[PDB]
Amino acid sequence: ALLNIFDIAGSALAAQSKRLNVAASNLANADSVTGPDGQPYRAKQVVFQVDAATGGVKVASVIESQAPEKLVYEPGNPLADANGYVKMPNVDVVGEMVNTMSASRSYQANIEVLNTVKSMMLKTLTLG
Amino acid sequence: GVPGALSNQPAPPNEAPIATP
């Protein structure tokens, strides 16, 4: 089926957009010290899966990465624990700087796939 | 329910409070 390409590439576009938004949010919150209720910011990631044989890619869910918080010592802070160690986001920088580029490249590649498929479908529309 | 589908119920507004009251 050549119609399924549209909702395969749309799924790919949506998944890559979600991944790029997650990476941008992590980069923005790379240094945020607290949330709305004292909960430290946690790096988040998306889960990709196949639609199903094989099909498009769907984002199953968004999960906070389970890594120890890079806690720092600020005793004169209300959020400090009993030992004065406040918790900071466990977000690197190279990871997101590469995730953005990879997501953009995949997005552009799927755009090219959709363009080619649409062109050949329109060409087939005038058989004979 | 699944994102991208069609549902006759409009989504509730999105809000981003700075601090929980």
């Binding site: 590469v98 990879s102 490249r105 552009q108 590649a109 090219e112 080619t116 | -």
Partner: protein, 249 residues
């Protein structure tokens, strides 16, 4: 396309190693400190054909046991260990940690301590008299003299417990107290025995052992490797971006 991931992983591990070196440099004056070594380990991935990927993960084998210098502060109850001496103290959870920080303090009730951790000698946590002057012998004997009393009333009151560890069988802990590894613990027993071959001296306090030349060379190498990896990332991204144009029609 996946060649970008090995380079970014190398850059991230270089950043981690730089963080380790910075942490080593930060505490360049804490008494009884042991530096943190660092190294890079290759971790090849064995796929099906043409194994051309070998990642890298930073690793720290452990502290190097080269003793630092010792400052002569002339304080009566400051001890400095031998080449492989270890003062045994009681940690927060009852485990016996080993330190080289000889700065011993005395509480109001005559209880000895080191940074809040009660030092244990022959027996249990040793407690000297209330307000007596304390002197440390050349092998760990503790003598107490009640102030105002005649000098011929100085009496031994306890003895420190000094253990000998080679250095390649001890690992650091989260709090910062070295403990034996599993194999060494099994071979030498759960708790070490106070060997009599270790001799110490009073009036001096041992500093840290961090090499500025090693730190500087490591920092320079890390910066250069990071720059090379960044260039590789840029090249791979450019190639992939220009190659995706082939997919068009």
């Amino acid at each position: 396309d996946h060649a970008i991931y090995t380079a970014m992983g190398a850059a991230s591990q270089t950043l981690n190693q730089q963080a380790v070196t910075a942490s080593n440099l930060a505490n360049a004056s804490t008494p009884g400190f042991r530096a943190q070594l660092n190294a890079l380990r290759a971790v090849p991935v064995d796929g099906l054909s043409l194994a051309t990927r070998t990642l890298v993960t930073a690793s720290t084998p452990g502290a190097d046991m080269t003793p630092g210098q010792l400052d002569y502060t002339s304080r009566p109850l400051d001890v400095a260990l031998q080449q492989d001496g270890w003062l045994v103290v009681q940690a927060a959870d009852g485990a016996e940690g080993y330190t080289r920080n000889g700065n011993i303090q005395v509480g109001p009730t005559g209880q000895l301590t080191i940074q809040g951790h009660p030092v244990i000698g022959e027996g249990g946590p040793i407690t000297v008299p209330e307000g007596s002057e304390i002197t440390i012998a050349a092998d760990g004997t503790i003598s107490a003299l009640n102030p105002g009393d005649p000098p011929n009333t100085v009496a031994p009151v306890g003895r420190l417990k000094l253990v000998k560890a080679e250095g390649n069988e001890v690992q650091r802990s989260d709090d910062g107290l070295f403990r034996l590894t599993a194999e060494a613990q099994a071979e030498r027993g759960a708790v070490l025995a106070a060997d009599p071959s270790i001799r110490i001296m009073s009036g001096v306090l041992e500093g840290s052992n961090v090499k500025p030349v090693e730190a500087m060379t490591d920092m320079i190498a890390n910066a250069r490797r990071f720059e090379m990896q960044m260039k590789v990332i840029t090249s791979v991204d450019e190639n992939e971006g220009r190659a995706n144009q082939l997919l068009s029609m």
